[PDB]
Amino acid sequence: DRGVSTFSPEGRLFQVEYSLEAIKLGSTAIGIATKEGVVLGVEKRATSPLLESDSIEKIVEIDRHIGCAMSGLTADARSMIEHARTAAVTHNLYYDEDINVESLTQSVCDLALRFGEGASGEERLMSRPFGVALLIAGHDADDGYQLFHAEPSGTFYRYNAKAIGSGSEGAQAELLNEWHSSLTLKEAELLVLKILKQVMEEKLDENNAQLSCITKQDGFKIYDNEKTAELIKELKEKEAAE
């Protein structure tokens, strides 16, 4: 066959590129960073009305100051979150302080390229790259509210706003237009909800999507359904107003 870490003639890693295709098939996730916080939203996308939608967990806490959202092969994300949590708690054990959001993201990205069938450099025992992308959001004293996009290539970019998953290219153009350095948190919540509403196949309600933020004051919160539902009432009333 062909080695799992083979380059293409264009100079790309076959497995990483294919991994990226798996992510395009995943549920939409959107993050927006403001000076009042970072909002993280996802499309639940239940496969049946018998599925208890609130058991869909695609937004997770890493630490009080870091949360993340996932898109793609979501089962692949469990050990990534486990590593992230451990890195955060561990850092705090060694340094009596919060880990920086960037350092946390870098740690997670370090895991990403540890795949192969025995590569000469260190012990990469993972048979394939992860099939999931992550949006890591948080706050720290030095560099404020931050949003990172962590890919299975080991690279991570910082974003003012970012969408990953099925509707991502569409959602991204919409984010390109709507984002400015002055949004408020409320404006950002509404804006995630709106963009998610455009790209989603079902009718977006408080059940088939989920919102969350991370602020300096209260940490990472996952909004309960009743709170999001009122924001959904509220987005409809402003779109009707013009």
Binding site: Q15, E21, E52, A75, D76, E117, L125, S127, R128, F130
Partner: protein, 241 residues
């Protein structure tokens, strides 16, 4: 020694070995779970390729993981034993360290994690198994039902089915299960479970087994007669119209 990457991505972004593991589930005998207001019922079909079996000693389809949690499955029988054992071991480990039995969600997350691990480790193939895990958290009287699959994904269902012709029985449950008013009783829960299997099994006293899980470790399997009394009554409703 043997660490060949068997589960890899193909060009369109699929992992075929996992996808094919699902095909193994599709061939397994059907399995269904419905939660009542105050119980969970697990139903399984028995195949008829061969008959002359010893039902006393033949491994039954529903497995106790602990006194309060049960597991059923569709797919490769042999593969399922590997999962059941790891789950039973973990259950005792949890009681040993935490001093509390596992929650149904905890146990489900463990089994799913094992499943996932086998999709990104050298030299192994995915489990050709999907599971239904059901029961009650220690000291909860709120019934729990979860489903796992070869990929390692898991989630909770009011009612779910897996295996051959699960497509059919899901249809039945979808237009027959109301979340507003779960089956109020063990009896009307069991009856809904048999009904769903009767869509697929096609005449089945000895072809249907039912386990009932009630709160605080009350788990019983029904006998043929008890089950057959449900089959008899259900077919009388059809002719009375």
């Amino acid at each position: 020694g043997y660490d060949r990457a068997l589960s890899i991505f193909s060009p369109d972004g699929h992992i075929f070995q996992v996808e094919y593991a699902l095909e193994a589930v599709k061939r397994g005998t059907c399995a269904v779970g419905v939660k009542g207001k105050n119980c969970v019922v697990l139903g399984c079909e028995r195949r008829s390729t061969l008959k002359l079996q010893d039902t006393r000693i033949t491994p039954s389809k529903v497995s106790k993981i602990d006194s309060h949690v049960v597991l059923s499955f569709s797919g490769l029988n042999a593969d399922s034993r590997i999962l059941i054992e790891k789950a039973r071991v973990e259950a005792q480990s949890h009681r040993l360290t935490l001093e509390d039995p596992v929650t149904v969600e905890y146990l489900t997350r463990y089994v799913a994690g094992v499943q996932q691990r086998y999709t990104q480790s050298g030299g192994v193939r995915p489990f050709g198994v999907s599971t239904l895990i059901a029961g009650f958290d220690p000291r909860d009287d709120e019934p729990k039902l979860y489903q796992t699959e070869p990929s390692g994904i898991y989630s909770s269902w009011s009612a779910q089915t897996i295996g051959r012709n699960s497509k059919t029985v899901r249809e039945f449950l979808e237009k027959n299960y109301d979340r507003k008013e779960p089956p109020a009783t063990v009896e009307e829960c069991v009856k809904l479970t048999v009904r769903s299997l009767l869509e697929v099994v096609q005449t089945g006293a000895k072809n249907i087994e039912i386990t009932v899980v009630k709160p605080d470790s009350d788990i019983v399997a029904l006998s043929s007669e008890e089950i057959n009394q449900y089959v008899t009554q259900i077919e009388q409703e059809k002719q009375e119209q």
